[PDB]
């Protein structure tokens, strides 16, 4: 009786939200950006190839200096690369080799990683002893760690396969805020440029916008037909793009609270592993299971170019803060640095 | 380069030398993914031979590294394992269909299309006693078991009731029938009849993995 009545009210609220979004869907992003000229053909060459990982690379993250990057592989090795010289700066042996994510702190003093061991390990890069040591192990998730991102030297946000995201205080080792509401495994998260909000994508084909300080879900974005594997904020923080197993990328707007554009092709039938934006946000780079990385025109939904330099799945990619280059990691155990030429 | 850059490159080359030592150990070790249910008794099988529960054992100068897990997202991590050890409990007829449904998911998994399955039909002694008592009938759960006859090519163990042999091969046929449904020979299922107290379980994985490794080569030399 009471349960049946309540679940009927949820359906009414869902229709109310859907009608509200349809009310403000006066135009389409495709119509708005029809007049602007296309970006043309985007040609990028492999400037660097980072060799030394002996297993599938699953994650990479640039440091804020746009020169150092950290990559994680399931050979149990965290490696920090000097991208200009291809020098290996550090090699961090992981206690658990099943790492799925890695993050570089904006200060550059810490890196984080974690996987099927359900632990987020914090590593101190600047010690008087001259070696990288574990500074904190963040326990509390009951599923695998899928993504992690530093807010500062003391705060980090982690998403897990136990359907929850958490905000952690590294100094005390306790999660100050827990973000619940996803009904599937959360596969990725992205921080807003001001680090006041973050979006997370789960396997329930939905993307939720969370307030870091308040600790609740502000908005929920649907439209995908399968698990979301990747998510990335627009450089101004007013939009984000997702990638799912349905071979499509969607551009959601925070303020319009709805999907704006879909990035899919008939030839593309493979899942998407990673997504990122260029510095101006005009380019959307997506990694695919078909061994390729497709560069999309974010405004016009046109495939601007293809990065074909890997012999296995492109598992991750990322663009530097200055926008100079893009790195792609792959299951073939190699990292490549790409940029164009005049 | 400058004076510090040459020292930096020397540090980078000493890291590569340290990675080289780890690569030799990594490639020489075979990694097995152990799957099953709570009642499968997989934890006993690994214990006798000895998040993610990892076990390393060495048989005849060959190092085996077995991962015990207890799922479409984290199963991509085990994409490069040599074999998958799928364990079921044959005695529990009630949940056999769940095992068959679970086995079909793994066999037809997109990320496990080239990974052979060393299927273990655990607790055969319990299955023999359950059939011998006769209280429970497999035909209740599997009606097609009535029209099943033991093939003449069967090789029962000495001193074994023929009724057990008819039932024991029927369960094995159910899993093997799933294996031949699709795949086109890229990977092979390796049915076995083990028990918890069995001491030869390590050898069965050894010989089956040797066949898996050998069949990798014969695909490479025939340009398949």
């Amino acid at each position: 009786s009471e349960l049946d009545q309540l679940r009927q009210e949820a359906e009414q609220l869902k229709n109310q939200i859907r009608d509200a979004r349809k009310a403000c869907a006066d135009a389409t992003l495709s119509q708005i950006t029809n007049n602007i000229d296309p970006v043309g053909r985007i040609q990028m060459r492999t400037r660097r190839t980072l060799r030394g990982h002996l297993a599938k690379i699953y994650a990479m993250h640039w440091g804020t200096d746009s020169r150092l990057l950290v990559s994680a592989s399931q050979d149990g090795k965290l490696i920090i690369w000097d991208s200009y010289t291809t020098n290996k700066v550090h090699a961090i042996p992981l206690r658990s080799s099943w790492v799925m994510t890695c993050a570089y702190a904006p200060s550059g003093n810490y890196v984080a990683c974690g996987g099927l061991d359900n632990i987020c390990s914090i590593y101190n890069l600047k010690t008087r002893e001259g070696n990288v040591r574990v500074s904190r192990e963040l326990a509390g998730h009951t599923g695998y760690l899928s993504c992690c991102r530093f807010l500062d030297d003391n705060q980090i946000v982690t998403s897990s396969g136990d359907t929850t995201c958490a905000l952690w205080d590294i100094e005390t080792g306790q999660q100050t805020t827990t973000f619940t509401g996803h009904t599937g495994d959360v596969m990725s998260l992205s921080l807003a440029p001001d680090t006041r909000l973050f979006v997370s994508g789960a396997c329930d084909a939905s993307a939720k916008l969370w307030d870091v300080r308040e600790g609740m879900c502000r908005q929920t974005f649907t439209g995908h037909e399968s698990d979301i594997n990747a998510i990335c904020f627009f450089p101004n923080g007013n939009a984000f793009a997702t990638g799912s197993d349905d071979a499509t990328c969607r551009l959601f707007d925070l303020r319009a609270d709805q999907e704006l554009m879909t990035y899919s092709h008939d030839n593309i039938i493979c899942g998407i592993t990673s997504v990122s934006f260029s510095k101006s946000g005009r380019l959307l780079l997506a990694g695919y299971d078909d061994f390729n990385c497709n560069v999309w025109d974010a405004l016009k939904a046109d495939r601007a170019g293809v990065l074909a330099g890997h012999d296995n799945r492109v598992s991750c990619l990322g663009v530097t803060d200055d926008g100079m280059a893009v790195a792609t990691g792959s299951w073939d155990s190699f990292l490549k640095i790409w940029n164009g030429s005049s | 380069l400058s004076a510090e850059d040459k020292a930096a490159v020397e540090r980078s080359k000493m890291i590569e030398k340290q990675l080289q030592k780890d690569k030799q150990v990594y490639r020489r070790t075979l990694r097995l993914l152990l799957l099953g249910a709570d009642n499968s008794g997989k934890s006993t099988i690994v214990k006798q031979m000895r998040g993610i529960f990892e076990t390393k054992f060495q048989v005849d100068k060959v190092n085996f590294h077995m991962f015990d897990v207890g799922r479409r997202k984290w199963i991509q991590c085990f994409n490069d394992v040599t074999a998958i050890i799928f364990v079921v409990d044959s005695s529990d007829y009630n949940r056999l269909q769940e095992a068959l449904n679970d086995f079909k998911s793994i066999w037809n998994n997109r990320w496990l299309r080239t990974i052979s399955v060393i299927l273990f039909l655990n607790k055969q002694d319990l299955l023999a006693e359950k059939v011998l008592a006769g209280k429970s009938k497999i035909e209740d759960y599997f009606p097609e078991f009535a029209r099943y006859t033991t093939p003449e090519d069967a090789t029962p163990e000495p001193g074994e009731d023929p009724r057990v042999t008819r039932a024991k091969y029927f369960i094995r046929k159910e899993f093997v029938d799933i294996s031949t449904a699709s795949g086109d020979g890229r990977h092979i299922c390796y049915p076995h009849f083990t028990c918890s107290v069995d001491t030869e379980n390590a050898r069965r994985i050894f010989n089956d993995c040797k066949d898996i490794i050998l069949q990798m080569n014969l695909r490479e030399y025939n340009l398949v």
Partner: single-chain antibody
Amino acid sequence: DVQLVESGGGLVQPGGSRKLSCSASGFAFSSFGMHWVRQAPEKGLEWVAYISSGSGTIYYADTVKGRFTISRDDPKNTLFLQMTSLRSEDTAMYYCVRSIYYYGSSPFDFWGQGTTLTVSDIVMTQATSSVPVTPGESVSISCRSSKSLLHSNGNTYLYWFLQRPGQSPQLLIYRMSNLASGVPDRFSGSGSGTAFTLTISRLEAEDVGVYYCMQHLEYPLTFGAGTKLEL
């Protein structure tokens, strides 16, 4: 804590041989390159030898090349300096210096206490030998080099050291602008090409000492004469 203790020094006859040891504790010794730097009594610092991490690269100063042998024992975390044909010119305090080299590292960050031995090329110029100073007042120290220390990669390989009376030298500024860990923010390093300035705002009693500018553009590493601050 990070420690570097030297031993083996003492009075030796001219033309003799002596073995200096540097025991390291509290840090990963095998990851650090090691230098020997000596300082003659009432004189400036003089670089002696260098052995890299992994013992793959070894450098010597011209005045000691062929007579001194530098070696390390990574399992024991001990640094050695085998000396032969010792002359009266070798009478100095010998310092054990750790230095690790990667992008953004701080070489020459820690110095040992030193051991005293008594026996019976880019030019770095610090013309101002001494500067009378008062607490709370801003002081500038100038350094010059015969060659441009700016490399094509953008780095300017200039280092600043402070040797308080009775104490081992301490790193202040590495690569001409970066501030070493544990150094107050009042120290600031500014330079361009061949001319460099060290500005010390709000001088304090602890800042009193001799300041040396060292170049790390190429070997052999050379020190400036040194500028002394006195009250």
